[PDB]
Amino acid sequence: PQITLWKRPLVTIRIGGQLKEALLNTGADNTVLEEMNLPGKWKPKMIGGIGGFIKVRQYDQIPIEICGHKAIGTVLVGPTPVNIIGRDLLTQIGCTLNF
Amino acid sequence: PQITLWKRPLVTIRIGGQLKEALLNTGADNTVLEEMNLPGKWKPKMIGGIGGFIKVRQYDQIPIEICGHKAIGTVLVGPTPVNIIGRDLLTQIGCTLNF
C-alpha cells in the first residue's frame, strides 16, 4: 500500500504465531519489540532513543510477517514504549519514503 | 523523490537562513531540533520515547524548507541527540510510506 502519515503508521505484525501492533519507523535503525520470550541465542545490547538508553536482547534470523510480507532478520527485545519496525526490516519488505 | 532506507534518511533543512541536517522520522509525531534561538513565544513541553522523556520548548508558525519543500508549523527545540523531522512536517511535504 501507500500509507499516509496523518496518523501513526501502525501495522499488524506476526511473530512466533503472535499478533502484535507495530509502528513503521524510518527513524529507527533496528526493529525493537516489547518484552517477550523468543527462542534461541541472544546477546545483550544498549540502544539509544530520544530520552536516553535502554537495555535489549538481540536475537538474529528471526522470522516475522509485517502487513503481509515475510521477513527474516534481527529483532531487539526490551522496554520500548511501542513495537517498532526499523530500517533493517523496512528495506526487506520494499518500503520507501516518497514525497 | 523516492527515499530508500538502506541508510538513515538524512536531509538538509533550512530554517531562518541556517542549514541543518535532519532525520526523516515516521516514528515521531512532532519535529524536534537541537537548541536554536527561534523567534516568538514558546511553551514548555515534555516529549518521550525510548529511554524516557526530555523537556523542550515549543514554537509555532515556524517556516522551514525540507529538501526543497516549504513547510510552516510547530517546531520543538531541545536536547534531542539528532535533528528529527516528524509526521507533522512530513505530511506537509507530501510524504507517504510505500511498499
Binding site: 529507527a28 545490547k45 511501542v82 | 518521550g48 520515547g49 541527540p81 539528532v82 516528524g86
Partner: peptide, 9 residues
C-alpha cells in the same frame, strides 16, 4: 510518548 527515534548499539 511520541518520538521513537532509535540508534543502533
Amino acid at each position: 510518548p511520541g518520538n521513537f527515534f532509535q540508534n543502533r548499539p
